[PDB]
Design a binder for this molecule. Structure first.
Ligand SMILES: Nc1nc2c(ncn2[C@@H]2O[C@@H]3COP(=O)(O)O[C@H]4[C@@H](O)[C@H](n5cnc6c(=O)[nH]c(N)nc65)O[C@@H]4COP(=O)(O)O[C@H]3[C@H]2O)c(=O)[nH]1
Ligand SMILES: Nc1nc2c(ncn2[C@@H]2O[C@@H]3COP(=O)(O)O[C@H]4[C@@H](O)[C@H](n5cnc6c(=O)[nH]c(N)nc65)O[C@@H]4COP(=O)(O)O[C@H]3[C@H]2O)c(=O)[nH]1
Lengths: 374, 374
């Protein structure tokens, strides 16, 4: 087991270190601050002691390293010596739940840490080897994609709502399917809604049946009883519609043809636009936002996914060549470089769609360079 | 000291409750999920135990309150009847520090809870950071402006870097001065950096570069020691200065021939132009963007808070009229309409400096309709 890692140019502050080691835990300290930034991510969830007897290293960047997407993937911990530091003690606004005194009980500080160390041992115990496969990862396998799966697993099971904000065609629907399998309600229904063009009329027929409800009609939430309902591009939700989603959020009740009935649905969302501007402006209700933004997940873009662009092309060829019986089976080597350079605004989707176009053009078995430049 | 708060039908949690008012704590049990919201707001930084005997509470909404309005305003704690094996065990991703068994480890029990006294006893010390009755909002007071005060006061204390983006003359720096006053550093120096024509000469002379005296200007960083530094139009920085920003954000150094020093700088940023269009261009480094975009704060356009345009002029007249002893005292009822009509591409800076004109040009006590033909 390799969790537990303090960070300071000191490290010689061992009136508490071998006490953690002699109990059989070891330790891994950090000096500079450019290094743990790359460590805390890869390590995922761990206990990190930030020793601050002033000790030379900052306070602004100290607050940054704690929050720079290291919130959920790190349980915070701090250390100082009598140094009450009444001023910027506001650093404990970031749930550094317990400090570290100088009259240390070199055995009962283990009572605090050990309960927190035993708190982290909860997570990895029921899955101590998931990090490679994970049912193929469902898309790719890079640095931020290995990162993505590590988050997906520790945010899956908890039947809370999750905000999925990423670029267009990053696979918000793909991610929603992924965590659904881990949500223990996997078998139960899954519903994806392209809320972009719902245009109030039918979008409200789903919840409170307006001046028409054909026969069954059966609400999108009615079918999604024991399962999961997803709403993509949630910022495209009209004002009077956000309330009804907020209604089901605050009550858990939708109207069907054979009477109004309450259900229990884990509702997920998917964001495309800048979420901050939409809130200040008042496009979207912020009280509903806090319900969805319980936990955030960033779906990596292709610009952030270098050593992985190539894999997405090899396996997309397969499903598409087999589908349409094309006489091609590989790109040329120059076509490999030509794809890892493209902006990929549509990300996976554009690489997906454009490749499908190519397949239905080429007469050759190997895909050259010139034809697909646009 | 007056904390105690429980929540569930478990009045039959006599198996562990009454030992909490002895030792000396003011308990208060709740039952209905909706009331603790109104309760946990006014009670403040109390410690609340949330029972999860799988009795009633929709865990999706339970995780909400943990993050909604009760972050610092509540030290989390949970109780359950050994419901491990499944996802409920993983539901302790919501930072619930400690679990609760069932066969009361009494003499050990408090070691879980009571280790939060000295921590919670702190939270009560730095709570009334509201103060100043709110700096009059510094500017206006509409709907989209009412949003800004709260978000400013929240992201204020957290000494992290914050990205401040908006339109051309929205007053990005106007916001930077605000969280500086809600900071913990607070009184410490506030420094802003404009860079329309800063070149590479003087900006690199700020950090190191030339300047080899014993009081020669002294680095914009060194003067901002312990305070706050803002870089307006941050995205136009050349790489070699983006590096210097990233160098300082990862190390924290700046050289002076009179002796190199390290400083404590909360590096905020201000942006107007579309950031994303420049990211793909490879002009701005993404690693630096991370450190800066730790927190986003959006400044609204006039189009959406047009219900404040009538107020800005009223105060911009009041401050200018007394300043230059103008005979101007009020606007015409028709003059009000036209001010909401000039669109104002340059936002507040436009409306402010354009009033400087009319005030120093108009001769009547009431600014007539014929005046605003500009
Ligand atoms: N004194 C003065 N002259 C004006 C004004 N508006 C336009 N001009 C003149 O008209 C030229 C072309 O303007 P443009 O199409 O807007 O294209 C402009 C404009 O888009 C931009 N530019 C230069 N200064 C500014 C500025 O202060 N604000 C803005 N928003 N753009 C500027 O760069 C381009 C170059 O403008 P120039 O080299 O100056 O060449 C400008 C300028 O000589 C003004 O309000 N005051
Ligand atoms: N169409 C047009 N109008 C002109 C021109 N020159 C002066 N004006 C007008 O008369 C006002 C005077 O602008 P200013 O004295 O330069 O004071 C301006 C100027 O200092 C600056 N500015 C705005 N646009 C430009 C620009 O395009 N180029 C430059 N160099 N400065 C600009 O912002 C100030 C506010 O400009 P405004 O609100 O627009 O109001 C401007 C503008 O409406 C021109 O060449 N073309």
């Amino acid at each position: 087991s390799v969790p537990g890692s303090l960070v300071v140019v000191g490290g010689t502050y061992e009136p508490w270190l071998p006490v953690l080691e002699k109990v059989g835990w070891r330790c891994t300290q950090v000096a500079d601050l450019r290094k743990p930034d790359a460590l805390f991510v890869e390590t995922g969830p761990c206990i990190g002691i930030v020793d601050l007897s002033h000790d030379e290293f900052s306070l602004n960047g100290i607050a940054n390293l704690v929050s720079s997407h290291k919130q959920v993937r790190w349980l915070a911990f701090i250390r100082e010596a009598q140094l009450s530091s009444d001023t910027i003690c506001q650093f404990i606004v970031n749930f550094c739940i317990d400090f570290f005194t100088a009259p240390i009980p070199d055995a009962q500080l283990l009572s605090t840490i050990g309960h927190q160390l035993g708190m982290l041992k909860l997570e990895k115990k029921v899955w101590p080897h998931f990090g490679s496969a994970g049912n193929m990862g469902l898309i790719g396998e890079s640095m931020p994609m290995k990162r993505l799966r590590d988050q997906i697993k520790r945010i899956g099971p908890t039947d809370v709502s999750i905000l999925i904000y990423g670029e267009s065609g990053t696979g918000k629907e793909t991610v929603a399917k992924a965590i659904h399998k881990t949500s223990s309600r996997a078998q139960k229904p899954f519903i994806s809604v392209n809320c972009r063009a719902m245009s109030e009329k039918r979008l409200e027929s789903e919840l409170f049946g307006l001046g028409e409800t054909e026969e069954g009609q059966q609400p999108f939430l009615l079918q999604a009883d024991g399962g999961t309902l997803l709403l993509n591009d949630i910022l495209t939700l009209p004002k009077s519609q956000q309330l009804n989603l907020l209604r089901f959020l605050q009550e858990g009740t939708v109207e069907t043809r054979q009477g109004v009935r309450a259900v229990d649905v884990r509702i997920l969302a998917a964001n495309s636009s800048d979420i901050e501007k939409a809130l200040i402006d008042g496009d979207f209700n912020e009280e509903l936002y806090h319900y969805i933004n319980v936990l955030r997940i960033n779906v990596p873009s292709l610009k952030e996914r270098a050593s992985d662009i190539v894999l997405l092309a090899k396996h997309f060829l397969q499903e598409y060549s087999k589908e349409y019986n094309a006489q091609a089976r590989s790109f040329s080597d120059d076509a490999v470089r030509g794809l890892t350079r493209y902006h990929w605004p549509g990300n996976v989707r554009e690489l997906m769609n454009q490749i499908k176009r190519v397949v239905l053009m080429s007469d050759t078995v190997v895909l050259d360079e010139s034809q697909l430049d646009l």
